[PDB]
Design an enzyme around this catalytic site. Structure first.
Site, PDB file in Angstrom:
ATOM      1  N   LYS C  19      -7.981  -6.268   9.826  1.00 52.78           N
ATOM      2  CA  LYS C  19      -8.394  -6.435  11.207  1.00 52.78           C
ATOM      3  C   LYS C  19      -9.539  -7.465  11.191  1.00 52.78           C
ATOM      4  CE  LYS C  19      -9.650  -3.740  15.334  1.00 52.78           C
ATOM      5  NZ  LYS C  19     -10.717  -4.657  15.827  1.00 52.78           N
ATOM      6  N   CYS C  85       8.993 -14.093  11.338  1.00 54.50           N
ATOM      7  CA  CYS C  85       8.353 -13.809  10.024  1.00 54.50           C
ATOM      8  C   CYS C  85       8.679 -14.864   8.961  1.00 54.50           C
ATOM      9  CB  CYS C  85       8.806 -12.448   9.521  1.00 54.50           C
ATOM     10  SG  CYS C  85       8.891 -11.222  10.840  1.00 54.50           S
ATOM     11  N   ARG C 188       3.280  10.714  10.925  1.00 53.73           N
ATOM     12  CA  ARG C 188       3.980  10.705  12.208  1.00 53.73           C
ATOM     13  C   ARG C 188       5.347  10.017  12.170  1.00 53.73           C
ATOM     14  NH1 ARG C 188       0.144   8.779  14.676  1.00 53.73           N
ATOM     15  NH2 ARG C 188      -0.978  10.677  15.317  1.00 53.73           N
ATOM     16  N   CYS C 200       5.309  -1.266   7.963  1.00 54.27           N
ATOM     17  CA  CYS C 200       4.190  -2.168   7.761  1.00 54.27           C
ATOM     18  C   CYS C 200       3.424  -2.266   9.083  1.00 54.27           C
ATOM     19  CB  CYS C 200       4.652  -3.534   7.261  1.00 54.27           C
ATOM     20  SG  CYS C 200       5.337  -4.601   8.549  1.00 54.27           S
TER      21      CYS C 200
END
Ligand SMILES: [Zn+2]
Ligand SMILES: [Zn+2]
EC number: 2.3.1.310
Lengths: 132, 384, 385, 131
Positions: C19, C85, C188, C200
Site C-alpha cells: 500500500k 495484467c 473468508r 491475490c
C-alpha cells in the site's frame, strides 16, 4: 483526515517575523540548475539543493479570463503564466476583473483562495495582482 | 523512426463520427473489417500483428475489437497503446514498425473510442491552481493576438474553414456553413476561445492495414500509399519561459519527419493536424514550417490553408468537425489522408489530387510540458 | 517473436510492493532510475526508446514517469501499453523488439501501478450480465480440477503456504512468512473453493528492465548480462464451445511457441514466475506449461517439485499471492526478480543451485468466450561465463 | 427505461405457452454454431439459420458465490452449462449452496438474474436440478 487549507510550504514561504511572503526556488548544488521543489534534479539527478527566494514581482506573459472552468470553482476566474526575473515561469490565478489584464503587464505576489478543499474550506495559495 | 524497408498502406477503415449507441469494440470492429476488405482480406488469418489505440474504454481494447472477427489467437499478437490523443496514430506507427523491420509483412493499426455511452490529478501543480485545457490553449491565442495583431474573428476563420471542408463529408459530425459571427457569438469558454472554437467529445474508429511492397503485389493493391516517414517524440519538461506561439515538440517532430522522409513542409499538399482548438491549427502552420515564424495569420488570411492554397489543412474537417474520440483521431487522420491521395473523397475531394499527405496528433501534457507526446506521419502516392 | 539479433538485460529496477502513498509516476521513476543506475547509465540520452505498462492510472503513464528524470524529449519516443495484467511484460517485450530489430541498441521497459490511492467489464458482456466475478470464474476451474483429480481445498491452500514461504526473506513482497493450510482454508470464502487467502490482493508497485544489444553490454560494462532466449505475445481464442478449463488454450500455445523459438524446453526451466492471481491458476499452469503431464499437477505440487528441492522453483519471489497485483507492474516485476535470481542476488530467498533458465508468465483480461485476452511469456538465460 | 428481459436474440419465450428455449445460430457458409451475431466469427458470413437448443444440459462446473457482483444478493450460484449441441452457456443455478456437482443434469428455467437501473428485476434464463 482533514484536507489542506494552504498550498504549499515547499513552494511558498510565510516568514516567521511576519515579513512579506515569497515563492521558493531551489538551486541544484551539483549542476547549478534553478527549479521549483523536487526530490531529484531533472538535469543531473542530484538530491542536494539550496533554497533560493524568488522575486515577488513578475510579468503576465499570457492569461485567460475563464468562464467555464474546473468543476467546483466559482466563475469567472483568471489564470496566467507569470514570468519571474530568475527565468522561471509560474502558473497562477490573477486577482481582479475580466477584460482588465494585458500581456507583459507587471504583477505582484499576493495570497488568496485558489479553490475549496474536500471539506469545503478554501485553500490559501499564491496569486498575482496588479501593482498599485 | 527510419524505415529499414518500404511500408505501404493497403485498405483503410473509418466509421461515422458522432454520438454512437454502439461501443468502442463494435466501432473498432467496423473500421478494422472495412480496412481488411479494402486490402482484399476476406479471411481472419492474413494479418500477423495488431496494435490498437484507446484512451479511457478498456485495458484490452484490441482483444475486444478483434474478438467478433475470430482473429484473436496464437497468430495474432495484440498490443494496446496509449498516449492520450496520440494513441490511434501510435497504433498505426507500431504496425508500420513491425513491417519496416521485417517482424511481419502485414499488420493492422486500429484507433477506437466511445465516450458518450459512458483529466489530471489535483497533485499536478497547474490543476491545483485551477487549470483547464481550453484556458491553456486560450493563453496561446491571447499571446499570439498580442504579438501578431490577430483578432477573435481571425481565430473563428479556422472553424469556418474546417466546417466548410467537412460539408460534403458523411463521416464528419458538425459540417456546413457557419459564419465568423456565429463562432465569435457562441458561449465564451476561456477568452478568446468560444464553444464553436473547441473540438467536442465524440465516438468513432478508424483502421489502417500496412504491408511490404511484395505484400501489396500479393494482395493486388491498386493504389498503395507509401509511408515516407513516421516520428514519435515525448515532450520536454522545464519551468523556464517558453514561446507558447511555438510548440517545442511539434517543431522537433516535424523537422525529424522532414529529415527522415526527404520531404519538406512546402511539398505537403494536405495536412490533418491536432485542431482541438482554432489557435492550435493557426500556430501549427508556423511550428510545422508551412510558413515563417510570425506569418501564420497572413497564411490563413491569404487562403493558403484551404482549397487552391499551398496546403489544404484539415480537408476532412479536422477535430473541429469530427469531434475527438481520443483513441481514434490519430488513425482517422491517416484513413482520410489515404482516401484523398486515392482521389476517393467525392464532394470534399481536394482539387489537384494531393500526392503528399501529412498527419499530426499530440496528447497529454502535465505542468512544464507543451504536450506529453507527438506522432506525425508523411504519406505519398505509391503508384504510377 | 523470433529475435533477429541477440538481446540482453542490463540493469533492473523494483520498488517495494504494498500500500503506497506515492503515485504510479513516483513508483515508476524509482524503478526506472534503479534499472538505469544498474546499467551504469551516466548519460540518460543512451536510452533510445521507452515502453510503459499501466492498467488504470493514466493515458500518458511513461511521460509522467520519465518527466522527473528530464528524459522526455526528441531523443525519447515513449509509447504506453495495455493488455490488463500483460502490460508490464508487454512494455519489456516492446523494448526487446526495438533492440532485436536494430531500431535501437538500448531500450527500457517500465511496468507501474498505484491502485490504493484512488477510488476504483460492462453489463453488456453476457457473463457479467449473469453476475460473473473473476474469483468465481477461477473457482470453477478449481471445482472442475478437484472433480477430475481428487484435489482438496487443502491442496489448493498449499500454493499460498508455499508462495508466502518463498517470500519470507523477500523485502519487496507485501505478505510473506509462515501461514498454515488451516488459516488459508479458514479465511473468508469468496467463491467456493476460493478463500480470501487464495486470492491475490490489489497492490501498488513498479519495476523496470533495461535491454540492449551484446555490443551495448560491453559498452556499458555489464558484469552479468541476462540473455533474452525468447519472448512470445498472443491473444486469446474466442468461441462458445465446451473447453477443458483445467487447461488454458492461450497459456499452452504461448508456452509451446516460447519453447520452439528459444530451443529451451519446460524441463530445463529452473525458476518460474506465474500469473498466480488464484492458487488454482498456479496448480493448473504446471500442466499447461508442460512442467508435468496432463492431470499430474496435483502430484507435482504434493511431491514438492514446484518448491526448493524440486524440478522448478515456481513463484520464488512469492508471486502475486505475496506481492499483491498492481496491474501494470507485475509483468515487469516478474522479469526484474528472475534477473536477480540468475545473478544470485536474492540473499535469504536465493534459489539453491543458482538458476540458469528463468521463465515468466502473465495473462490479463478475458471477456465471455475467451480464457484470457492476452498472454506474455519471456525465457531468460545466463549470458555470462 | 432499462431492460426487464435478457435477451430476445438468445432466449425465446413462446406466447402460445410453449416451453421456453435458448436460440442457437448456424452459419450457412461454414457450418459454425454460435449464439446470435451480426457476422460469423469463423468466416465473416452474415447468413444464418436459427437452431433451437436443448432445454437440458450438464453442469460442466459451478461456484457458490459469497462475495459477488455489487447489487446482487448473496449467496448465489453460477455455472458453465454444456448443451448436447456442443455449446457452453454461462448461467445462474437455482437452489442452495453445497448441493451441486460436476456433470449433474440440469434444465432451463426462467427467473430474476439481477435488478435493472430502475430497480426492477431482469428476467432471464437460469438452470435448475431436474425433478
Ligand atoms: Zn542538478
Ligand atoms: Zn461462417
Amino acid at each position: 483526515e482533514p484536507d489542506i487549507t494552504f498550498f504549499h510550504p515547499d513552494i511558498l514561504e510565510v516568514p516567521k517575523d511576519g515579513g512579506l511572503p515569497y515563492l521558493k526556488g531551489y538551486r541544484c548544488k551539483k549542476c547549478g540548475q534553478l527549479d521549483f521543489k523536487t526530490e531529484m534534479c531533472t538535469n543531473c539527478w542530484s538530491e542536494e539543493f539550496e533554497m533560493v527566494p524568488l522575486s515577488r514581482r513578475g510579468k503576465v506573459y499570457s492569461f485567460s479570463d475563464i468562464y467555464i472552468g474546473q468543476q467546483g470553482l466559482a466563475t469567472p476566474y483568471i489564470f496566467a503564466y507569470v514570468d519571474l526575473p530568475e527565468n522561471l515561469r509560474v502558473f497562477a490565478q490573477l486577482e481582479g476583473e475580466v477584460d482588465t489584464y494585458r500581456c507583459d503587464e507587471e504583477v505582484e505576489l499576493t495570497l488568496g483562495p485558489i479553490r475549496m478543499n474536500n471539506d469545503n474550506l478554501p485553500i490559501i495559495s499564491y496569486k498575482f495582482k496588479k501593482i498599485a | 523512426m527510419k524505415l529499414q524497408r518500404e511500408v505501404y498502406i493497403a485498405g483503410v477503415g473509418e466509421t461515422k463520427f458522432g454520438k454512437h449507441t454502439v461501443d468502442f469494440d463494435v466501432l473498432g470492429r467496423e473500421a478494422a473489417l472495412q480496412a481488411m476488405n479494402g486490402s482484399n482480406i476476406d479471411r481472419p488469418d492474413m494479418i500477423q500483428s495488431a496494435y490498437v489505440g484507446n484512451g479511457m474504454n478498456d485495458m484490452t481494447t484490441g482483444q475486444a475489437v478483434f474478438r467478433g472477427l475470430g482473429m484473436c489467437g496464437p497468430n495474432l499478437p495484440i498490443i494496446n497503446v496509449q498516449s492520450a490523443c496520440s494513441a490511434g496514430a501510435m497504433a498505426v506507427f507500431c504496425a508500420i514498425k513491425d513491417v519496416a523491420t521485417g517482424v511481419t509483412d502485414l499488420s493492422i493499426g486500429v484507433g477506437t473510442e466511445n465516450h458518450t455511452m459512458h483529466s489530471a490529478a489535483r497533485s499536478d501543480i497547474e490543476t491545483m491552481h485551477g487549470a483547464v485545457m481550453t484556458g491553456k490553449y486560450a493563453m496561446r491565442a491571447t499571446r499570439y493576438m498580442h504579438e501578431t495583431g490577430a483578432t477573435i474573428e481571425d481565430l473563428a476563420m479556422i472553424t469556418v474553414k474546417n466546417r466548410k471542408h467537412a460539408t460534403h463529408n458523411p463521416y464528419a459530425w458538425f459540417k456546413g456553413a457557419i459564419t465568423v459571427e456565429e463562432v465569435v457569438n457562441s458561449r465564451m469558454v476561456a477568452y478568446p476561445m468560444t464553444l464553436q472554437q473547441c473540438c467536442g467529445i465524440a465516438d468513432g474508429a478508424a483502421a489502417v492495414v500496412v504491408g511490404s511492397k511484395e505484400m501489396m503485389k500479393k494482395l493486388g493493391i491498386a493504389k498503395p500509399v507509401k509511408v515516407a516517414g513516421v516520428v514519435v517524440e515525448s515532450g520536454p519538461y522545464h519551468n523556464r519561459p517558453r514561446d507558447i506561439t511555438g510548440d517545442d515538440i511539434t517543431e522537433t517532430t516535424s523537422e525529424k519527419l522532414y529529415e527522415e522522409s526527404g520531404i519538406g513542409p512546402k511539398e505537403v499538399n494536405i495536412l490533418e493536424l491536432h485542431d482541438a482548438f482554432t489557435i492550435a491549427e493557426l500556430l501549427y502552420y508556423e511550428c510545422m514550417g508551412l510558413c515563417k515564424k510570425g506569418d501564420g495569420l497572413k497564411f490563413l488570411r491569404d487562403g493558403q490553408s484551404t482549397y487552391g492554397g499551398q496546403c489544404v489543412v484539415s480537408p476532412r474537417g479536422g477535430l473541429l468537425s469530427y469531434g475527438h474520440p481520443i483513441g481514434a483521431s490519430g488513425a482517422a487522420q491517416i484513413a482520410q489522408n489515404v482516401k484523398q491521395l486515392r482521389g476517393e473523397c467525392g464532394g470534399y475531394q481536394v482539387g489537384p489530387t494531393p500526392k503528399v499527405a501529412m498527419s499530426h496528433v499530440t496528447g497529454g501534457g502535465l505542468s512544464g510540458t507543451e504536450h506529453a507526446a507527438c506522432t506525425m506521419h508523411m504519406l505519398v502516392k505509391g503508384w504510377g
